[PDB]
Amino acid sequence: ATIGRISTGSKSLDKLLGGGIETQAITEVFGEFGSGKTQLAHTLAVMVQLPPEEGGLNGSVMWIDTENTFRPERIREIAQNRGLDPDEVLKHIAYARAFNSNHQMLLVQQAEDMIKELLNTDRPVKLLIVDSLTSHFRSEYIGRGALAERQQKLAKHLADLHRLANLYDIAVFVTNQVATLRVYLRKGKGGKRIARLIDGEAVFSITEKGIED
Ligand SMILES: Cc1ccc2[nH]ccc2c1
Ligand SMILES: Cc1ccc2[nH]ccc2c1
């Protein structure tokens, strides 16, 4: 099945990514606190809902939040400035807070039910966000013997995500505070954000349109 490509809102970043973030893939953004990872997530949750000729996939969204950082009003704001209706856009984001890492893993299995339901409708799920992929795993797996167990659980979680991405043609987008594709993000001068691929650089600003050049 052809890979779909979701515009980030930044032409610079889109170019770096080869046209946008890919379906049938997990794109992992890395960066320090305040780098803009969650702003990119909010922007993508809007962009994906655009028609293909405007950089989207006419898609629905599922969002797993581990840090209570999802902001419906930010979504409304971005939607308004991208030519979309803020209420309709929010309606197409299925939102869940993950209580701990085990519940986070279960929510991915739960997501498949809605994915199946919407699959052959005109608004299939096309983006699954996990923000943050690792925050619960970091806080819970501490002490002698914990590392091997943390890593096994995280591997299983990533495998579950890859399966949804590949089986249902979805872009999975995850954040990691300091992957088929790893992107390092950092805040620079004048509040500009700079992105680099791991294993040129794109530059963008955070604005009322989400992100743009
Ligand atoms: C952190 C947190 C708190 C309350 C919740 N209810 C459902 C999920 C969830 C997660
Ligand atoms: C409503 C809903 C149900 C299951 C889910 N899994 C991930 C997000 C999510 C949202």
Numbering used by the authors: 108 to 285, 309 to 329, 336 to 349
How did the manuscript describe this experimental structure?
In this work we have targeted the protein–protein interaction between the tumour suppressor BRCA2 and the recombination enzyme RAD51. Consequently an alternative strategy using the RAD51 orthologue RadA from the thermophilic organism Pyrococcus furiosus was employed. Consequently the N-terminal domain of RadA, which contains the self-associating FXXA sequence, was removed to prevent RadA filament formation, and the resulting monomeric protein with an exposed FXXA binding region was found to be stable and suitable for screening. The quadruple mutant “MAYM”, which lacks the E219S and D220A mutations, the side chains of which point away from the Phe pocket and do not contribute to the shape of the Phe pocket, was found to crystallise more readily in a form suitable for compound soaking and was used for all subsequent crystallographic work.
Ranking these hits by ΔTm, the top two fragments were found to share a common indole core. These were 5-hydroxyindole (1) and 5-methylindole (2), which gave thermal shifts of +2.0 and +1.5 °C, respectively. To quantify the binding of each fragment, the dissociation constant Kd was measured by ITC. Both 1 and 2 were found to bind with a Kd of 2.1 mm. A titration of FHTA against protein preincubated with 5 mm fragment showed no binding of the peptide; this suggests competition between the two ligands. To gain further insight into the binding of the fragments, both were soaked into crystals of humanised MAYM RadA. Interestingly, replacement of the 5-hydroxy group by a methyl group, as in fragment 2, makes the indole core flip in the pocket to orientate the methyl group away from the water molecule, which remains bound in the crystal structure by residues Met221 and Gln217, rather than being displaced. The indole nitrogen proton forms a hydrogen bond with the backbone carbonyl group of Leu214.
